Structure formats: structure tokens, C-alpha cells
Amino acid sequence: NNPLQQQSSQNTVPNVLNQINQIFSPEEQRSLLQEAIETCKNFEKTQLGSTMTEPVKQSFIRKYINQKALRKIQALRDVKNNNNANNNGSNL
């Protein structure tokens, strides 16, 4: 009787950026973007408090959103027999 807390497979899952429109609604994405900007200021206060270029901040937001998306996907992975699917087809 070994203890069980959680278990999830780890692997590189590419082509997840295009799935951001399926994982999150655009209205939600806009809110997340605004939150990410505020988060960037939070990051700025702790580290990197000087002249910063725009792409590094943009990359930080993209990484932040992607990490959050992965957590959400993992949260939905907690249900068994649950996976993303197109759910579009026709029987003919």
C-alpha cells in the first residue's frame, strides 16, 4: 500500500500555441494578457529593474501564459479518459 498523491507524464508537447484558442477563450486571453503585464511589473520589482527591451518582456508574457496553460491542461488531465479532441466530423 504505497501512497498516491498525483501522477502525470512529462513530455514535450509542441503546437500548443495554436491550441491556446481552444484552451482559453479570446476574452479570457485578453484578461490574461492584462494580468501578465501586471505580473511583469511584479517581476521587474524583484529582478531586472533597469533599461529593458520590449521582446524580452513579450517573451516573458508568452512563457508565463504558456506555463499557466500547461498547468490548466494538467488540471484537466486529472480526469481519466479526458483528452483534447477536434470533436468535429460527420458520419456518411
The residues spanned by each domain of the chain are: 1-92
Judge residue 59's burial from the number of C-beta atoms within 10 Å of its C-beta, 0-12 exposed, 13-18 middle, 19 or more buried. exposed
* Integer Cα distance of 91 and 4 in angstroms: 42
Sign, Cα dihedral of 16, 17, 19, 25: positive
For the chain, give percent helix, strand, coil, nearest 5. Answer: 55, 0, 45
Compute the C-alpha angle 9/13/19, nearest 5°.
Answer: 120
